[PDB]
């Protein structure tokens, strides 16, 4: 389903990374986790020399992040394998909910 | 029945007014340290049982049934030496009943430290004197040195086999540090910021060791509760509320005084009898804050026949806290008085939790507006709603203690607030 | 009152500061009260001792010395010194007259007490007098409530020896100015109720309850 | 203005959750057997609209 | 036009709200703590050709830093001029401030 | 709704909604047959295909979702028959 | 009737670590039982239930605090909304995170936080990535009744890394706990009491500790922000790659 | 300046940094100021309350204006 999809040939030998975006460390809120996204590396972005702004050349610059977000690694892998991309799934690192309680702040250092 | 009459041989805090010597050779004459060896030998379970049977409730704002509180302490010691922090620190506005026990018969307080310590399996008592009570804690350290020299405290509890030593800590000017869960920390050395309740002081309090924080008046009537009759004690006050509270008639009474008197006493009877009367006669009364400052007002139409006991004053949409009755007559600006109370709760709020830390400065700003009249007639419903946002959410009951004065002021004197607002409106234009 | 430190030649962490003698013993005793560890418990008494020793205020060098004596990071000592109100962190002169201002005082003329005291001294509220002697500072409920208006002096003249935190209660503007003048003249006015006809915390017409001679009740 | 309680005024999130329950063959054969007859008023009403000539009678040409 | 505060000092603190709200993404903002210490935009370039003139930037800006001057007469012979440079040509709003301040003083009621 | 009682149960195969406009998420095989129903039917007369909205859900297995809108000028109602067909 | 309930997996795929499969306490989060190990705070007993309870000072790595009451879920038989961060889940406890009392408690607290807080969101470096902005725009009220003089705080010098604007800071104490515990240097402090509370070193003291630049990610508010990343970008412009680091061999 | 040398190539009109560093700091009474903007609270920046506990002038971040305690 890569050939019928009209995508040019040179963008079906692309190497993607099917990660799950970790939580933004700045804000302690999990409302953006569990949305697996293909990551077309799309690193090539120069600076259009007339003005200060940048200028990509890869068509898959933004769609990796924007508007292409699956809901499960199986669906994302099925997607990146239909289209014939070389996906390397990077598993998401999840937190241990280690047991913790308030009364541990007021622990007694014996003597 | 009809309460109020307490005879001079039934007052527990003799030498209240410091007329006689407070220390030993002057305390043994008043029955202090009389036969505490027998009491300690009577055991811990017997002490807790007689305190529960006497129905003694918390002399402090909490109003919790003492004895039952002392049964919360662990029986088998698991290495953590159970402490006993005495809440000498008050700092509640209106309350001097502690100041007349720390000085002026402190040996009752020390003997109560000992008797409650053997009562709750304690191992040391930290009398957290309020910081400003410098002369009071000097008298108390004098009496402590005495009770140490007289073999009463320390390495043998009054010659008994109980190792119990009383150390005297003193804070430094913080009403917030006085709270039960904040006493433990302000004494642990950290700031006087309360801890959350899920760890209860009886389970993990001072130094993480179990402990129970008791107001001096509850710990100090404990000796005479045991030496006299727990039936005799419970013979005062109404059914549930029983004992002889130490009152402090604070302001706008022609003869302000702190006087010990039976609980369940009619507030009007107390005012008219002991402290004289509301300045300018009872018909001059405007409002009364019956407990300390942590309690709503009483608008003088439900202050005639209200009894100074926990249950009735709670049923009158108020509370009996330290029973530091503050009286206000028709000459005062009651909104300015409650504005200064809210300023007090803004100042003495350790700021640990957001609902109090911020909303109390907010209550102070709204009160300093409404006392001039700068508000709008719907803010009196914001003020009610702001107070109800503060009340249930704060870590300790200071949030309560800061939402309750304003809540009571609104609930009762909403006509006066609305009148000030409308008068400001008509002053404009 | 800033909740942080602005260096000054009088007050900076460079200055060497340490408990003088006749106070090292008090330090040892205070630390003896609380256990070997948890000696942090003694930060309130040690800080108050440093405040008495340094004439009424806590320089940062003093907080650092208390931290060295008590073995916690100086931030914890700084946190407790800025938290508790009795710890003055800037010089408050020699006496620092603390006039209560809560409602049980406010309704009983404590605002007039403070205004009379201020206009007599001539300082805004908390500024120290040019004489360096006096300073006024509002304080919330001081316990002295039935003794309706009150004023607490903190005699910092001698230091940890003549340190008297006297309660001058039941005062009036005239009583307050008299107390201040008798304080600047050197002597120590008699504390307690500045209003006779009442014993301490008494009903103002002679107590009406505690009259009979105390004696062991029927046990 | 001075009553900013929101969860009562909320519209974005103050809605009943989606109740997506499955129907299996038993349920629909039960429903088909329960539907005994299609009496009138179990039928969708017609949006009746007829045309009627009018020149300027609405208000008299003045609105 | 990027407005200024009456006492000089470009009104444009670099929050990037207009760069965010822009439907056509015309505004490219790069920010740097200037030596004075107060944030400011090293690059504030609106691409007028890639701009829909919807006034979203005027609404989104918190301090009214970016406003649309009633100019509308700026047809340029060459496209590169039509890309309004970083805070230099949008800084020509100082000439239009006499009319922009008037329009804002009369519209702020809405 | 009357339309769900008469409609053969198999035709409304997968889903069915009851607000924001009602829909019969059907199967691709029974679609034009389902569109034959709701039109040329006395009590359900749509006659008007308002719109055919392709919707692409990449995370599904049947990627697209061809959302046929349908207006019923007679009974003044609007039904949104849907489907699901992937790229091939 | 053959409903299809959502899966209700943990909040962030959080692996729940049973110390043993015997002491699993079963609590009801919005009438949906969840088996949490013994000792889980109500907040963690809800993060096991997928319910994301708004927290300002509760960090899983850091200690537990009540410096604010943004969580306040209503458990079944308690008289007041219990702070979820410190209340340990008891077996059978019924946690109602969305009951009107819980939502009103959350709105109350998010009004107090935004009461003395300055309107620095445009000039705040963490304007987009802000717990306060994203909790006000999601759980806090749409309007604020406070129209008075907010309190303001000077900006402490905490070094060439952490730009400090303590006026924005909500005094949740998260950083003063991070520097005392994880960073272990003990320089930050909650100086003063009341609204006058100020977070930072009492004497001008650059945070000499390494590992103390993470206080910015710890900080739920712009107050503590990277001074190197002074204002150069925004939370939305930044395209993020989950790279690794090569400076030190900890990787 | 150097930051202002990135967007301004005129270098003849005074750089905004100098235009704001040459306006004197505004005396005030209390310990907190408003600086709502120019004059009209609706044509200035969101009101930014500044603390004046320090001795040096505390700038308003949005407008660059400076306030001193004036005790
Ligand atoms: C708002 C508040 C005010 C308090 N005020 C006092 C007080 O004035 N005196 C005191 O001894 N304890 C005070 N406490 C501490 C406890 O409420 C309680 O009084 C003490 O821990 C035990 O007293 P009891 O054993 O007589 O109940 C206060 C606590 C709170 C939360
Ligand atoms: S903010 Fe109020 S409730 Fe919270 S710890 Fe401080 S005084 Fe207690
Ligand atoms: S009007 Fe403003 S926000 Fe809209 S496209 Fe143009 S520059 Fe962008
Ligand atoms: S123009 Fe407005 S939105 Fe854009 S950076 Fe400046 S202040 Fe922010
Ligand atoms: S932290 Fe910054 S962005 Fe967030 S609400 Fe506060 S000022 Fe606004
Ligand atoms: S500086 Fe940040 S982390 Fe520290 S208390 Fe303030 S808001 Fe919390
Ligand atoms: S009135 Fe509270 S102590 Fe003077
Ligand atoms: S974060 Fe749990 S209540 Fe403050
Ligand atoms: Zn400004």
Numbering used by the authors:
A (entry chain O): 39 to 149
B (entry chain A): 53 to 481
C (entry chain B): 31 to 249
D (entry chain S): 67 to 129
E (entry chain D): 112 to 221
F (entry chain F): 8 to 95
G (entry chain C): 50 to 300
H (entry chain P): 38 to 108
What do the authors report?
Complex I is the largest multimeric enzyme of the respiratory chain, composed of more than 40 protein subunits. The main feature of the plant complex I is the presence of an additional globular matrix-exposed domain, bound to the membrane arm. It holds an overlapping position with the NDUFA10/42-kDa subunit found in mammalian complex I5. This domain is formed by a trimeric complex, the carbonic anhydrase (CA).
Focused refinement and particle polishing were performed in RELION314 (see “Methods” section), allowing reconstruction of the full complex I at 3.7 Å resolution, focused classification on the membrane arm and PP module yielding 3.4 Å. The PD module being more flexible produced more scant densities reporting lower resolutions. The cryo-EM maps allowed the determination of many well-resolved features and clear side-chain densities that enabled modeling of the 45 proteins of the plant mitochondrial complex I, as well as several characteristic ligands that were directly identified from the density: the eight canonical FeS clusters of the matrix arm, the FMN of the 51 kDa subunit, the NADPH molecule in the 39 kDa subunit, three cardiolipins two phosphatidylinositol and one phosphatidylethanolamine. Similarly to the previously obtained complex I structure, the supernumerary subunits, specific to mitochondrial complex I, form a shell around the core subunits, adding nearly 400 kDa of proteins to the conserved subunits. In the Q module of the matrix arm, our reconstructions allowed us to clearly visualize ubiquinone in the pocket formed by Nad1, PSST and Nad7. Here, the overall structure of the γCA is conserved: it is a trimer composed of characteristic left-handed beta-helix monomers, forming triangular prisms. Hence the only conserved active site is at the interface of the two γCAs, which we confirmed by visualizing both the zinc and an additional density most likely corresponding to HCO3−. Interestingly, the CA domain is in tight interaction with a peculiar lipid complex positioned below the latter and between the plant specific P2 and proteins B14.5b and Nad2, close to the Nad2–Nad4 junction.
